[PDB]
Design a binder for this molecule. Sequence first.
Ligand SMILES: O=c1ccn([C@H]2C[C@H](O)[C@@H](COP(=O)(O)O)O2)c(=O)[nH]1
Length: 245
Amino acid sequence: CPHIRYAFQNDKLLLQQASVGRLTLVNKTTILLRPMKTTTVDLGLYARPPEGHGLMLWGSTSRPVTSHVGIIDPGYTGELRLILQNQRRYNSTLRPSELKIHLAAFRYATPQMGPINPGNVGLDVSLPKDLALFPHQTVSVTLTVPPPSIPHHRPTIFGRSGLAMQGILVKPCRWRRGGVDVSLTNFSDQTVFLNKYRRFCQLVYLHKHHLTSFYSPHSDAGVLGPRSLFRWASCTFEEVPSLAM
Ligand SMILES: O=c1ccn([C@H]2C[C@H](O)[C@@H](COP(=O)(O)O)O2)c(=O)[nH]1
């Protein structure tokens, strides 16, 4: 893996380290999460993945907060943001050091082809039926028609940022042979009506090397869960201050 070029400037976050292909930031200040609303963290972070790679952005905390897992497209030169949701019906705070923010790369592949719909990592997946997502509840839907097989890669499902901003998170998961149950959780106070054919998540083909059952400083259960640990590419971070905007 060639360098991940990056820039970082934000006095409210600490760069903890950039090690074995993962950069980790921590919050220096208290972050307040209102209930029933999105909290976004403007990271002051910019990054460009080497050829053949995308970037994965995720948050980790033991507090009752759920973060969107962000798929970062290779041509994206804007600022990175972390999108957070409050699990509780009261204010939740992340005191300094309670939030870790991780960025790391991965190889991905793209099929040439609803239900599965310019350089983006993920292909949009459409809703097979209308769903009403009531406030503070989860709704699940099954995708059974298998996506194209790509040698040495594994299909996986992630959310998109647009729905995350409206309080709707997708739990990322592997799309195995036999089908996948996709769970959408509404962290808002508003019932959201998603209609048939609406894009609701994205299919991403990770190189098989990026899923492992082994725990180490090279993998993390925070992305797709504890069965399918995410093992990022072993790239080097290279600071390029000019990238900051
Ligand atoms: O958590 C995220 C997810 C995405 N992005 C940026 C990088 C992506 O290329 C772009 C669009 O993301 P989606 O709408 O496809 O999620 O926004 C973020 O800053 N944070």
